[PDB]
Each structure stands twice: as structure tokens, then as C-alpha cells.
Design a protein around this ligand. Sequence first.
Ligand SMILES: C=C1/C(=C\C=C2/CCC[C@]3(C)[C@@H]([C@H](C)CCCC(C)(C)O)CC[C@@H]23)C[C@@H](O)C[C@@H]1O
Lengths: 236, 7
Amino acid sequence: HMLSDEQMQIINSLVEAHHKTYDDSYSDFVRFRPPVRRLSMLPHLADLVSYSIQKVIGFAKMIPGFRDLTAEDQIALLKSSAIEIIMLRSNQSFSLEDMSWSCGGPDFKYCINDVTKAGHTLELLEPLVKFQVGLKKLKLHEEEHVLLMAICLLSPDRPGVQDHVRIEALQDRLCDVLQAYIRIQHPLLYAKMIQKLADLRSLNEEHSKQYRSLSFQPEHSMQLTPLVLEVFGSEV
Amino acid sequence: ENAXXXX
Ligand SMILES: C=C1/C(=C\C=C2/CCC[C@]3(C)[C@@H]([C@H](C)CCCC(C)(C)O)CC[C@@H]23)C[C@@H](O)C[C@@H]1O
């Protein structure tokens, strides 16, 4: 019923990793291509996602044990999970009152209508918003929020992974930390959090489907960034 | 260009 010193240091490392890679001021958003309201929101949202992928890379590198993996394993994990971590980390800007992502100002307030102007349809945006609502209602502590992101990223069942046993042992240790944290802090939540990981798989699928139609139009793929094209691309 | 060398 006590958290070990190593388990406590894992939480401290993950919370510190998230604070170093998530800027609550969103002051960098002014450097993206501006949002305008034929896919008028694609340049801004492409820059937003590309910026967020680089933050996820920095977060992943600070996960204890992630740096010990081979370079190929680190890339494979990030490529497969980047869109899921972005969907998870975006809950911090999501608001149940607005049903949208608020990032400081009306220019950087993104609703469902904005994402349709980036090439996506309600077949993705409806389950995505329902996901954000259900996740927001969990009222996760920052410790639980960052543990869920690290657990999602260290999933062993990802395409291209080589050392499945070592990655699962790292994820298992993170799950034990989360379960021990929940038992101490919440005298059912863990099952709800694990369910959200399965939801992220379905959202990953639908986004990958819709991203392929987007990236196969040269007029749209050229509006993306190098990092987006590489992370979301089918290249192996 | 030098592109996954953001490992
Ligand atoms: C980025 C983050 C934020 C919002 C995430 C959103 C809002 C707008 C639409 C998004 C970006 C979804 C889009 C379906 C992604 C489409 C990308 C592309 C056009 C390339 O297929 C995924 C997450 C949604 C803001 C902040 O929380 C940082 C976070 O990190």
C-alpha cells in the first residue's frame, strides 16, 4: 500500500517530462501558419500537429527506459503512437463547456467545424470528441494523465517493434506504478483508463484511413510538414 | 536532406 522510491521517481520523471514538453501558454502557436475560416485550416493544423509530434518525441525520450531501446524500436513506437499521444495530450486544452480545444484566444480555439476544413469528416471527429468528453470526465490527475501517455507510447503491440519483451516489461512496470498510484490516491478507474487505450486504437485507424486520402492529393500533401509526412506516412 | 536522426 506504499509507493516505492523507484516508482515515485518514475512519476517524478514523467511529470517533469510533460511540463518540459507542454507549454500551457501556447505562445508558440503564433509561429504556425495562420488559421483561416478548399481545406483552409490544413496549414495551421498541420503546423500544430507537427509541433506536437516534436513535443511527443521529447516526452518519449525522457520516459525512463525508452532511451535504452534501440533507435529503430524508439522510432517504431513513436511512429505508431504519435497520433494517439497527441489525442491524449490534447485533452488538457479540451473543454466540456465549449466542446472544443481552447489554446489561448479565438484564433487558436478549434471546434469540429475547423477540423473538417483540414480534410477530416465526422466519421473521425465525432468519436474523437466523444473520446475527449469521456476522458475529461475521468478527471485524471496529472500523474495519471502522464502515466497513461507513457503506457500508450510503450505499447509492445506496435508495427515494426523488434524487442517486444523488453518493451512490454517497461510498460508493465509503468502499469504497476499507475495501479499503485490509483490504490493510494483513490480509496474501476484503471479499467476505464485501459479502455481509453483501446479507444485510441480505433481513432488511430480512422485517422490513418482519412490521412491516406488527404496525403494522396498532391495539392494537400504539399501543405503538410516533413515531420508529419514521415510520422504519418506508410514508409517502413 | 538529413531527415526520425529529431532519435
Ligand atoms: C495538438 C494538440 C491540441 C489540439 C488537438 C486537436 C485539435 C484540432 C484537431 C486535432 C489536431 C485532431 C486532427 C484529427 C489531427 C489531423 C492532422 C492531419 C491534418 C495531418 O491529419 C487530432 C487532435 C485534434 C492543442 C494542445 O492541447 C496541444 C496538443 O498537442
